[PDB]
Protein backbone atom coordinates (compact mmCIF):
# COMPACT_ATOMS: atom_id res chain seq x y z
CA UNK A 1 0.00 0.00 0.00
CA UNK A 2 2.86 2.47 0.83
CA UNK A 3 1.21 5.92 1.48
CA UNK A 4 4.38 7.16 3.31
CA UNK A 5 3.89 10.15 5.69
CA UNK A 6 5.75 13.54 5.87
CA UNK A 7 9.55 13.82 6.40
CA UNK A 8 9.98 16.13 9.45
CA UNK A 9 7.59 13.87 11.34
CA UNK A 10 8.34 10.52 9.71
CA UNK A 11 5.92 7.70 10.52
CA UNK A 12 7.37 4.98 12.76
CA UNK A 13 5.38 1.74 12.83
CA UNK A 14 6.52 -0.90 15.31
CA UNK A 15 6.32 -4.47 13.96
CA UNK A 16 6.28 -7.24 16.57
CA UNK A 17 4.61 -10.57 17.38
CA UNK A 18 3.87 -11.42 13.75
CA UNK A 19 5.01 -13.32 10.65
CA UNK A 20 7.04 -11.08 8.33
CA UNK A 21 6.25 -12.26 4.80
CA UNK A 22 9.38 -10.71 3.38
CA UNK A 23 8.92 -12.76 0.17
CA UNK A 24 6.12 -10.52 -1.09
CA UNK A 25 8.41 -7.56 -0.54
CA UNK A 26 11.31 -9.34 -2.24
CA UNK A 27 9.53 -10.77 -5.32
CA UNK A 28 7.70 -7.74 -6.75
CA UNK A 29 9.15 -5.38 -9.38
CA UNK A 30 7.42 -2.16 -8.26
CA UNK A 31 10.58 -0.66 -6.68
CA UNK A 32 13.57 1.24 -8.01
CA UNK A 33 15.31 1.50 -4.61
CA UNK A 34 15.92 -1.55 -2.38
CA UNK A 35 19.30 -0.83 -0.70
CA UNK A 36 19.89 -3.07 2.38
CA UNK A 37 22.29 -2.37 5.26
CA UNK A 38 23.42 -5.14 7.60
CA UNK A 39 21.12 -7.86 6.22
CA UNK A 40 20.99 -9.93 3.09
CA UNK A 41 17.89 -9.10 0.94
CA UNK A 42 17.62 -12.72 -0.25
CA UNK A 43 18.15 -14.25 3.20
CA UNK A 44 15.71 -11.98 5.06
CA UNK A 45 13.26 -14.82 5.71
CA UNK A 46 15.84 -16.59 7.88
CA UNK A 47 16.65 -13.53 10.04
CA UNK A 48 14.58 -13.21 13.24
CA UNK A 49 14.57 -9.84 15.01
CA UNK A 50 12.92 -8.55 18.17
CA UNK A 51 11.49 -5.40 16.58
CA UNK A 52 11.11 -4.10 13.05
CA UNK A 53 10.55 -0.36 12.71
CA UNK A 54 9.01 0.96 9.48
CA UNK A 55 10.02 4.60 9.01
CA UNK A 56 7.76 6.08 6.29
CA UNK A 57 8.56 9.38 4.55
CA UNK A 58 8.77 10.94 1.07
CA UNK A 59 12.04 12.42 -0.21
CA UNK A 60 13.49 13.76 -3.46
CA UNK A 61 15.89 11.78 -5.66
CA UNK A 62 19.08 13.73 -4.93
CA UNK A 63 18.56 13.10 -1.22
CA UNK A 64 18.24 9.33 -1.56
CA UNK A 65 22.01 9.10 -1.16
CA UNK A 66 21.46 10.89 2.14
CA UNK A 67 19.15 8.17 3.50
CA UNK A 68 22.12 6.15 4.67
CA UNK A 69 24.42 5.94 7.69
CA UNK A 70 26.99 8.73 7.60
CA UNK A 71 25.15 11.05 5.19
CA UNK A 72 24.53 14.81 5.43
CA UNK A 73 22.36 17.45 3.70
CA UNK A 74 19.11 19.41 4.06
CA UNK A 75 16.98 16.29 4.51
CA UNK A 76 19.52 14.03 6.15
CA UNK A 77 20.50 16.75 8.57
CA UNK A 78 17.47 18.93 9.41
CA UNK A 79 14.49 16.67 8.61
CA UNK A 80 15.19 12.89 8.63
CA UNK A 81 18.52 11.71 10.04
CA UNK A 82 19.69 8.04 10.08
CA UNK A 83 22.31 6.67 12.49
CA UNK A 84 25.81 5.70 11.37
CA UNK A 85 25.16 2.15 12.62
CA UNK A 86 21.70 1.83 11.03
CA UNK A 87 20.64 -1.80 10.64
CA UNK A 88 17.79 -2.40 8.19
CA UNK A 89 16.86 -1.84 4.50
CA UNK A 90 15.56 1.33 2.75
CA UNK A 91 12.81 0.35 0.24
CA UNK A 92 11.89 3.40 -1.87
CA UNK A 93 10.02 3.93 -5.10
CA UNK A 94 9.11 6.65 -7.59
CA UNK A 95 5.67 7.97 -6.65
CA UNK A 96 5.18 10.64 -9.34
CA UNK A 97 1.83 9.17 -10.38
CA UNK A 98 0.63 8.82 -6.76
CA UNK A 99 1.69 11.97 -4.86
CA UNK A 100 2.34 14.64 -7.52
CA UNK A 101 -0.19 17.39 -8.30
CA UNK A 102 -0.61 19.56 -11.40
CA UNK A 103 -0.03 22.82 -9.52
CA UNK A 104 2.80 21.48 -7.41
CA UNK A 105 2.14 19.42 -4.30
CA UNK A 106 3.36 21.65 -1.50
CA UNK A 107 1.86 19.65 1.36
CA UNK A 108 5.20 17.85 1.64
CA UNK A 109 7.90 19.90 3.33
CA UNK A 110 11.56 19.41 4.10
CA UNK A 111 13.73 21.41 6.44
CA UNK A 112 16.23 23.77 4.88
CA UNK A 113 17.12 25.95 7.89
CA UNK A 114 17.09 24.53 11.46
CA UNK A 115 19.26 25.11 14.55
CA UNK A 116 20.77 21.57 14.50
CA UNK A 117 20.87 18.16 12.88
CA UNK A 118 18.36 15.50 13.84
CA UNK A 119 19.22 12.61 16.10
CA UNK A 120 18.66 9.09 14.76
CA UNK A 121 14.90 8.45 14.78
CA UNK A 122 14.15 11.91 16.26
CA UNK A 123 10.69 13.21 15.29
CA UNK A 124 10.77 17.05 15.51
CA UNK A 125 7.40 18.63 14.67
CA UNK A 126 7.80 22.20 16.01
CA UNK A 127 6.43 24.94 13.73
CA UNK A 128 8.00 28.02 15.37
CA UNK A 129 9.17 30.54 12.78
CA UNK A 130 12.95 30.25 12.56
CA UNK A 131 14.92 33.36 13.53
CA UNK A 132 18.04 33.36 11.37
CA UNK A 133 19.28 36.75 12.58
CA UNK A 134 19.09 38.62 15.86
CA UNK A 135 15.73 40.32 15.22
CA UNK A 136 12.73 38.55 16.82
CA UNK A 137 10.31 37.46 14.13
CA UNK A 138 7.16 37.69 16.31
CA UNK A 139 5.21 35.58 13.83
CA UNK A 140 6.20 37.72 10.82
CA UNK A 141 8.41 36.40 8.02
CA UNK A 142 11.07 38.67 6.58
CA UNK A 143 14.79 39.35 6.52
CA UNK A 144 16.60 36.83 8.74
CA UNK A 145 13.16 35.30 9.42
CA UNK A 146 12.70 32.08 7.47
CA UNK A 147 10.17 29.31 7.96
CA UNK A 148 12.17 26.22 9.01
CA UNK A 149 10.28 24.08 6.47
CA UNK A 150 9.90 24.52 2.72
CA UNK A 151 7.55 22.86 0.25
CA UNK A 152 8.31 20.72 -2.80
CA UNK A 153 7.00 21.83 -6.16
CA UNK A 154 5.81 18.32 -7.06
CA UNK A 155 4.29 18.37 -10.55
CA UNK A 156 3.43 15.69 -13.13
CA UNK A 157 5.80 17.51 -15.50
CA UNK A 158 8.69 17.53 -13.02
CA UNK A 159 11.84 15.58 -13.72
CA UNK A 160 12.70 12.41 -11.85
CA UNK A 161 15.03 14.26 -9.48
CA UNK A 162 12.06 16.36 -8.37
CA UNK A 163 9.55 13.52 -8.29
CA UNK A 164 8.49 12.15 -4.91
CA UNK A 165 9.96 8.87 -3.78
CA UNK A 166 8.39 6.95 -0.93
CA UNK A 167 11.01 5.56 1.47
CA UNK A 168 10.36 3.06 4.28
CA UNK A 169 13.40 1.76 6.28
CA UNK A 170 13.01 -1.56 8.25
CA UNK A 171 15.21 -1.04 11.30
CA UNK A 172 16.06 -4.50 12.64
CA UNK A 173 16.42 -4.45 16.42
CA UNK A 174 17.57 -7.51 18.35
CA UNK A 175 16.99 -7.06 22.08
CA UNK A 176 17.34 -9.41 25.02
CA UNK A 177 14.01 -10.89 24.02
CA UNK A 178 12.51 -13.93 22.23
CA UNK A 179 12.54 -12.10 18.85
CA UNK A 180 8.89 -12.44 17.79
CA UNK A 181 9.02 -11.22 14.15
CA UNK A 182 10.24 -13.82 11.63
CA UNK A 183 9.52 -14.75 8.05
CA UNK A 184 7.25 -17.54 6.86
CA UNK A 185 8.12 -21.16 7.61
CA UNK A 186 8.49 -24.10 5.24
CA UNK A 187 5.95 -26.94 5.38
CA UNK A 188 5.61 -30.18 3.43
CA UNK A 189 2.98 -32.84 2.78
CA UNK A 190 2.25 -35.47 5.44
CA UNK A 191 3.35 -39.01 4.52
CA UNK A 192 1.66 -41.91 6.34
CA UNK A 193 2.53 -45.60 6.79
CA UNK A 194 6.16 -45.15 5.70
CA UNK A 195 9.47 -44.58 7.42
CA UNK A 196 10.34 -40.91 7.14
CA UNK A 197 12.82 -38.61 8.81
CA UNK A 198 10.36 -36.27 10.50
CA UNK A 199 10.47 -32.92 12.27
CA UNK A 200 7.20 -31.77 13.87
CA UNK A 201 7.92 -28.33 15.32
CA UNK A 202 10.80 -29.23 17.63
CA UNK A 203 10.26 -33.02 17.77
CA UNK A 204 12.64 -34.85 15.45
CA UNK A 205 13.35 -38.46 14.66
CA UNK A 206 12.87 -41.35 12.26
CA UNK A 207 9.77 -43.50 12.15
CA UNK A 208 6.45 -44.61 10.72
CA UNK A 209 3.46 -42.39 11.43
CA UNK A 210 -0.08 -43.76 11.57
CA UNK A 211 -3.50 -42.51 12.62
CA UNK A 212 -3.80 -42.36 16.40
CA UNK A 213 -6.80 -43.35 18.51
CA UNK A 214 -5.56 -41.31 21.49
CA UNK A 215 -7.33 -38.19 22.76
CA UNK A 216 -5.05 -35.27 23.65
CA UNK A 217 -5.98 -32.33 25.81
CA UNK A 218 -6.33 -29.03 23.89
CA UNK A 219 -2.88 -27.85 25.06
CA UNK A 220 -0.76 -31.02 24.72
CA UNK A 221 1.59 -31.05 21.71
CA UNK A 222 3.08 -34.56 21.88
CA UNK A 223 2.88 -37.82 23.80
CA UNK A 224 5.64 -39.60 25.69
CA UNK A 225 5.67 -43.12 27.10
CA UNK A 226 6.98 -44.56 30.39
CA UNK A 227 10.54 -44.66 29.00
CA UNK A 228 10.70 -41.00 27.89
CA UNK A 229 10.18 -41.98 24.25
CA UNK A 230 7.91 -39.86 22.07
CA UNK A 231 5.10 -42.06 20.80
CA UNK A 232 2.52 -39.60 19.46
CA UNK A 233 2.40 -36.10 18.02
CA UNK A 234 -0.31 -33.62 17.15
CA UNK A 235 -0.06 -32.49 13.54
CA UNK A 236 0.74 -28.74 13.66
CA UNK A 237 -1.60 -28.02 10.73
CA UNK A 238 -4.61 -30.33 10.66
CA UNK A 239 -5.23 -31.22 14.30
CA UNK A 240 -4.84 -34.94 13.69
CA UNK A 241 -3.15 -37.12 16.29
CA UNK A 242 -0.50 -39.42 14.84
CA UNK A 243 1.19 -42.37 16.52
CA UNK A 244 4.92 -42.82 15.96
CA UNK A 245 6.06 -46.41 15.52
CA UNK A 246 9.83 -46.98 15.38
CA UNK A 247 10.95 -48.23 11.99
CA UNK A 248 10.83 -51.98 11.72
CA UNK A 249 14.16 -53.66 12.24
CA UNK A 250 15.40 -57.02 13.35
CA UNK A 251 17.92 -59.76 13.03
CA UNK A 252 18.20 -61.78 9.85
CA UNK A 253 18.81 -65.48 10.49
CA UNK A 254 19.43 -68.22 7.93
CA UNK A 255 17.72 -71.55 8.67
CA UNK A 256 19.22 -74.39 6.67
CA UNK A 257 20.14 -78.04 6.73
CA UNK A 258 23.88 -78.20 6.39
CA UNK A 259 25.64 -77.69 3.06
CA UNK A 260 26.44 -81.36 3.49
CA UNK A 261 22.95 -82.27 2.26
CA UNK A 262 21.66 -79.31 0.30
CA UNK A 263 22.74 -75.75 -0.39
CA UNK A 264 19.14 -74.55 -0.25
CA UNK A 265 18.34 -72.17 2.60
CA UNK A 266 15.35 -70.39 4.08
CA UNK A 267 15.66 -66.93 5.62
CA UNK A 268 13.77 -65.69 8.67
CA UNK A 269 13.36 -61.94 9.21
CA UNK A 270 12.72 -61.56 12.93
CA UNK A 271 9.74 -59.39 13.81
CA UNK A 272 9.34 -58.15 10.26
CA UNK A 273 5.96 -58.28 8.48
CA UNK A 274 6.07 -59.78 4.95
CA UNK A 275 4.69 -56.64 3.27
CA UNK A 276 7.82 -54.75 4.41
CA UNK A 277 10.52 -57.08 3.04
CA UNK A 278 7.14 -69.48 -0.57
CA UNK A 279 6.44 -66.57 1.79
CA UNK A 280 5.00 -67.53 5.19
CA UNK A 281 4.12 -64.97 7.85
CA UNK A 282 4.52 -66.51 11.30
CA UNK A 283 4.53 -65.33 14.89
CA UNK A 284 8.33 -65.24 14.84
CA UNK A 285 8.59 -63.04 11.74
CA UNK A 286 8.54 -63.39 7.97
CA UNK A 287 9.89 -66.74 6.73
CA UNK A 288 10.90 -66.86 3.06
CA UNK A 289 11.79 -70.01 1.13
CA UNK A 290 10.09 -72.63 3.31
CA UNK A 291 6.90 -74.45 2.30
CA UNK A 292 4.60 -74.57 5.31
CA UNK A 293 2.84 -77.91 5.83
CA UNK A 294 0.05 -79.32 8.02
CA UNK A 295 1.71 -82.59 9.01
CA UNK A 296 3.29 -82.31 12.43
CA UNK A 297 6.60 -83.92 13.30
CA UNK A 298 9.21 -83.88 16.02
CA UNK A 299 10.83 -80.46 16.07
CA UNK A 300 14.00 -80.46 13.94
CA UNK A 301 15.52 -76.93 13.85
CA UNK A 302 13.77 -74.38 16.14
CA UNK A 303 12.32 -71.20 14.52
CA UNK A 304 10.35 -70.16 17.64
CA UNK A 305 6.59 -69.86 18.38
CA UNK A 306 6.02 -73.64 18.02
CA UNK A 307 6.97 -73.44 14.34
CA UNK A 308 9.87 -75.70 13.35
CA UNK A 309 11.51 -76.26 9.98
CA UNK A 310 12.78 -79.48 8.42
CA UNK A 311 14.39 -80.70 5.20
CA UNK A 312 11.99 -83.23 3.68
CA UNK A 313 11.51 -85.14 0.45
Amino acid at each position, epitope marked *: ATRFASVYAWNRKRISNCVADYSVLYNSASFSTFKCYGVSP*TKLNDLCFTNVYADSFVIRGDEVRQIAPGQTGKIADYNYKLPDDF*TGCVIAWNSNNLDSKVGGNYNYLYRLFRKSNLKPFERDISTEIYQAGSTPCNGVEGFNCYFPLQSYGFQPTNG*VGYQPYRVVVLSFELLHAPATVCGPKKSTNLVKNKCVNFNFNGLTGTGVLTESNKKFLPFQQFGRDIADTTDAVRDPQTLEILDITPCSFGGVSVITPGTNTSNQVAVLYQDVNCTEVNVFQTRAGCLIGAEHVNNSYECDIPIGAGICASYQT
Partner: antibody
Amino acid sequence: QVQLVESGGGVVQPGRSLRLSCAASGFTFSNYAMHWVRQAPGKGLEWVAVISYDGSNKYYADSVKGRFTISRDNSKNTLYLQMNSLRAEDTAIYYCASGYTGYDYFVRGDYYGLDVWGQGTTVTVSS
Amino acid sequence: QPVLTQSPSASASLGASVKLTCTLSSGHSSYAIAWHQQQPEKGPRYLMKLNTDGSHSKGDGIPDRFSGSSSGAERYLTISSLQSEDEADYYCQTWGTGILVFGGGTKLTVLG
Protein backbone atom coordinates in the same frame (compact mmCIF):
# COMPACT_ATOMS: atom_id res chain seq x y z
CA GLN B 1 31.85 11.09 6.51
CA VAL B 2 32.99 7.63 5.40
CA GLN B 3 36.63 6.87 4.61
CA LEU B 4 38.48 3.77 3.35
CA VAL B 5 42.28 3.81 3.73
CA GLU B 6 44.17 0.91 2.13
CA SER B 7 47.25 -0.56 3.75
CA GLY B 8 50.31 -1.19 1.74
CA GLY B 9 51.70 -3.22 -1.03
CA GLY B 10 54.98 -2.38 -2.67
CA VAL B 11 57.47 -4.53 -4.56
CA VAL B 12 57.68 -8.34 -4.38
CA GLN B 13 59.18 -11.17 -6.52
CA PRO B 14 56.74 -13.07 -8.78
CA GLY B 15 55.40 -16.15 -7.04
CA ARG B 16 55.53 -14.54 -3.58
CA SER B 17 52.50 -13.28 -1.60
CA LEU B 18 51.06 -10.01 -0.12
CA ARG B 19 48.33 -9.04 2.34
CA LEU B 20 46.61 -5.78 1.43
CA SER B 21 44.44 -4.16 4.07
CA CYS B 22 41.60 -1.67 4.02
CA ALA B 23 40.75 0.30 7.13
CA ALA B 24 37.15 1.52 7.29
CA SER B 25 35.85 4.36 9.47
CA GLY B 26 32.65 6.38 9.58
CA PHE B 27 29.92 3.74 9.01
CA THR B 28 28.76 0.37 10.34
CA PHE B 29 31.38 -1.66 8.44
CA SER B 30 29.99 -5.03 9.45
CA ASN B 31 26.68 -4.37 7.56
CA TYR B 32 28.07 -3.38 4.12
CA ALA B 33 29.55 -5.40 1.26
CA MET B 34 33.23 -4.83 0.48
CA HIS B 35 35.16 -4.90 -2.83
CA TRP B 36 38.66 -4.97 -4.25
CA VAL B 37 39.26 -3.17 -7.54
CA ARG B 38 42.59 -2.72 -9.25
CA GLN B 39 44.01 -0.57 -12.02
CA ALA B 40 47.12 -1.58 -13.93
CA PRO B 41 49.45 1.30 -14.92
CA GLY B 42 47.65 3.00 -17.81
CA LYS B 43 44.86 0.39 -17.91
CA GLY B 44 41.22 0.70 -16.94
CA LEU B 45 39.52 -0.40 -13.77
CA GLU B 46 39.19 -4.19 -13.32
CA TRP B 47 36.95 -5.63 -10.60
CA VAL B 48 38.79 -8.23 -8.43
CA ALA B 49 36.70 -9.54 -5.52
CA VAL B 50 33.66 -8.88 -3.27
CA ILE B 51 32.67 -10.23 0.21
CA SER B 52 29.26 -10.30 1.96
CA TYR B 53 28.85 -8.38 5.27
CA ASP B 54 28.46 -11.78 7.07
CA GLY B 55 28.24 -15.44 5.97
CA SER B 56 31.34 -14.81 3.79
CA ASN B 57 29.68 -15.26 0.38
CA LYS B 58 32.90 -14.41 -1.54
CA TYR B 59 33.11 -13.93 -5.34
CA TYR B 60 36.20 -13.50 -7.55
CA ALA B 61 37.26 -12.30 -10.95
CA ASP B 62 38.49 -15.40 -12.68
CA SER B 63 41.91 -13.83 -13.32
CA VAL B 64 42.65 -14.23 -9.60
CA LYS B 65 40.61 -17.34 -8.77
CA GLY B 66 42.72 -19.79 -6.79
CA ARG B 67 45.45 -17.26 -6.02
CA PHE B 68 43.73 -14.41 -4.15
CA THR B 69 41.60 -14.63 -1.01
CA ILE B 70 39.17 -12.03 0.32
CA SER B 71 38.34 -11.82 4.01
CA ARG B 72 37.28 -9.34 6.66
CA ASP B 73 37.57 -8.83 10.43
CA ASN B 74 34.35 -7.18 11.52
CA SER B 75 35.71 -6.66 15.05
CA LYS B 76 38.42 -4.40 13.60
CA ASN B 77 36.54 -2.80 10.67
CA THR B 78 39.26 -4.12 8.34
CA LEU B 79 39.07 -5.65 4.87
CA TYR B 80 41.82 -7.96 3.59
CA LEU B 81 43.16 -9.14 0.25
CA GLN B 82 45.68 -12.00 0.34
CA MET B 83 47.51 -12.28 -2.96
CA ASN B 84 49.48 -15.46 -3.67
CA SER B 85 51.71 -16.55 -6.58
CA LEU B 86 51.94 -12.94 -7.65
CA ARG B 87 52.43 -12.29 -11.34
CA ALA B 88 53.75 -9.27 -13.21
CA GLU B 89 50.22 -8.69 -14.49
CA ASP B 90 49.19 -8.18 -10.85
CA THR B 91 51.08 -4.86 -10.91
CA ALA B 92 48.45 -2.19 -10.35
CA ILE B 93 46.91 0.19 -7.87
CA TYR B 94 44.51 -1.67 -5.59
CA TYR B 95 41.48 0.19 -4.23
CA CYS B 96 38.95 -1.12 -1.75
CA ALA B 97 35.28 -0.15 -1.92
CA SER B 98 32.00 -0.53 -0.03
CA GLY B 99 28.34 -0.84 -0.89
CA TYR B 100 24.87 -2.03 0.14
CA THR B 101 22.99 -5.21 -0.91
CA GLY B 102 19.92 -5.27 -3.23
CA TYR B 103 17.65 -8.05 -4.57
CA ASP B 104 17.99 -7.53 -8.35
CA TYR B 105 15.01 -9.14 -10.13
CA PHE B 106 17.21 -9.66 -13.22
CA VAL B 107 19.43 -12.25 -11.52
CA ARG B 108 17.01 -13.36 -8.76
CA GLY B 109 19.63 -12.88 -6.02
CA ASP B 110 21.70 -10.26 -4.18
CA TYR B 111 23.90 -7.81 -6.13
CA TYR B 112 26.64 -6.02 -4.22
CA GLY B 113 26.77 -2.27 -4.62
CA LEU B 114 29.93 -0.26 -5.06
CA ASP B 115 29.18 3.32 -3.93
CA VAL B 116 32.32 4.41 -1.98
CA TRP B 117 35.95 4.18 -3.13
CA GLY B 118 39.25 4.15 -1.24
CA GLN B 119 42.41 6.17 -1.89
CA GLY B 120 44.62 3.30 -3.18
CA THR B 121 47.81 1.29 -2.61
CA THR B 122 50.51 0.33 -5.10
CA VAL B 123 51.63 -3.28 -5.78
CA THR B 124 54.65 -3.89 -8.02
CA VAL B 125 55.55 -7.43 -9.11
CA SER B 126 58.93 -7.74 -10.86
CA SER B 127 61.94 -9.97 -11.29
CA GLN C 1 28.60 -12.48 -17.46
CA PRO C 2 27.40 -9.29 -19.17
CA VAL C 3 29.74 -6.91 -21.01
CA LEU C 4 29.65 -3.11 -21.27
CA THR C 5 30.62 -1.29 -24.46
CA GLN C 6 31.85 2.31 -24.09
CA SER C 7 33.22 4.57 -26.78
CA PRO C 8 36.98 4.92 -26.06
CA SER C 9 37.05 8.75 -26.22
CA ALA C 10 34.89 11.85 -26.38
CA SER C 11 35.34 15.62 -26.29
CA ALA C 12 33.35 18.83 -26.17
CA SER C 13 34.26 22.43 -25.50
CA LEU C 14 34.12 24.19 -22.15
CA GLY C 15 30.53 25.12 -21.38
CA ALA C 16 29.20 22.58 -23.91
CA SER C 17 27.49 19.29 -22.96
CA VAL C 18 28.24 15.63 -23.64
CA LYS C 19 26.26 12.39 -23.66
CA LEU C 20 28.57 9.56 -22.69
CA THR C 21 26.98 6.30 -23.80
CA CYS C 22 27.57 2.86 -22.27
CA THR C 23 25.74 0.18 -24.25
CA LEU C 24 25.54 -3.11 -22.31
CA SER C 25 25.28 -6.25 -24.49
CA SER C 26 21.80 -7.13 -25.86
CA GLY C 27 22.15 -10.27 -23.72
CA HIS C 28 21.35 -9.11 -20.15
CA SER C 29 19.68 -5.95 -21.49
CA SER C 30 17.71 -3.87 -19.00
CA TYR C 31 20.43 -4.60 -16.42
CA ALA C 32 21.06 -1.70 -14.08
CA ILE C 33 24.40 0.11 -14.11
CA ALA C 34 26.44 2.65 -12.16
CA TRP C 35 28.67 5.50 -13.35
CA HIS C 36 32.08 6.27 -11.89
CA GLN C 37 34.38 9.23 -12.49
CA GLN C 38 38.19 9.12 -12.54
CA GLN C 39 39.92 12.53 -12.75
CA PRO C 40 43.64 12.69 -13.57
CA GLU C 41 46.03 11.49 -10.83
CA LYS C 42 43.02 10.65 -8.60
CA GLY C 43 40.99 7.73 -7.34
CA PRO C 44 37.53 6.83 -8.61
CA ARG C 45 34.33 8.52 -7.47
CA TYR C 46 30.78 7.09 -7.50
CA LEU C 47 28.28 9.15 -9.53
CA MET C 48 24.91 7.37 -9.69
CA LYS C 49 23.06 4.12 -10.34
CA LEU C 50 20.83 3.89 -13.46
CA ASN C 51 17.79 1.61 -13.65
CA THR C 52 16.03 0.46 -16.83
CA ASP C 53 13.20 2.97 -16.25
CA GLY C 54 15.42 6.06 -16.38
CA SER C 55 15.48 6.45 -12.60
CA HIS C 56 18.78 7.37 -10.99
CA SER C 57 20.10 7.49 -7.45
CA LYS C 58 22.94 9.93 -7.02
CA GLY C 59 25.66 9.76 -4.45
CA ASP C 60 25.82 12.65 -2.07
CA GLY C 61 27.65 15.77 -3.24
CA ILE C 62 27.63 15.20 -7.02
CA PRO C 63 26.39 18.20 -9.05
CA ASP C 64 23.13 18.56 -10.99
CA ARG C 65 24.93 18.99 -14.34
CA PHE C 66 25.19 15.16 -14.34
CA SER C 67 22.02 13.32 -15.34
CA GLY C 68 21.32 9.76 -16.38
CA SER C 69 18.80 8.33 -18.83
CA SER C 70 18.12 4.97 -20.36
CA SER C 71 16.93 3.51 -23.68
CA GLY C 72 16.90 -0.03 -25.07
CA ALA C 73 20.16 -1.72 -24.19
CA GLU C 74 21.87 1.70 -23.94
CA ARG C 75 22.67 3.88 -20.93
CA TYR C 76 23.71 7.54 -21.03
CA LEU C 77 25.65 9.87 -18.75
CA THR C 78 24.83 13.50 -19.56
CA ILE C 79 26.99 16.40 -18.31
CA SER C 80 25.65 19.91 -18.91
CA SER C 81 27.57 23.22 -19.04
CA LEU C 82 30.97 21.49 -18.96
CA GLN C 83 33.70 22.71 -16.62
CA SER C 84 37.47 22.22 -16.54
CA GLU C 85 37.21 19.64 -13.70
CA ASP C 86 34.84 17.36 -15.63
CA GLU C 87 37.79 16.18 -17.73
CA ALA C 88 38.16 12.59 -16.57
CA ASP C 89 37.63 8.92 -17.32
CA TYR C 90 34.01 7.75 -16.94
CA TYR C 91 33.55 4.06 -16.17
CA CYS C 92 30.14 2.46 -16.26
CA GLN C 93 29.86 -0.75 -14.27
CA THR C 94 27.13 -3.33 -13.93
CA TRP C 95 26.44 -6.52 -11.96
CA GLY C 96 26.34 -10.15 -12.89
CA THR C 97 25.95 -13.15 -10.59
CA GLY C 98 27.81 -11.99 -7.51
CA ILE C 99 30.44 -10.48 -9.71
CA LEU C 100 30.56 -6.98 -11.15
CA VAL C 101 31.92 -5.91 -14.53
CA PHE C 102 33.33 -2.60 -15.72
CA GLY C 103 33.52 -1.18 -19.23
CA GLY C 104 36.64 0.01 -21.00
CA GLY C 105 36.07 3.60 -19.91
CA THR C 106 35.67 6.89 -21.75
CA LYS C 107 38.36 9.59 -21.66
CA LEU C 108 36.40 12.86 -21.85
CA THR C 109 38.69 15.79 -22.87
CA VAL C 110 37.75 19.49 -22.44
CA LEU C 111 39.01 21.52 -25.47
CA GLY C 112 38.13 24.94 -23.97
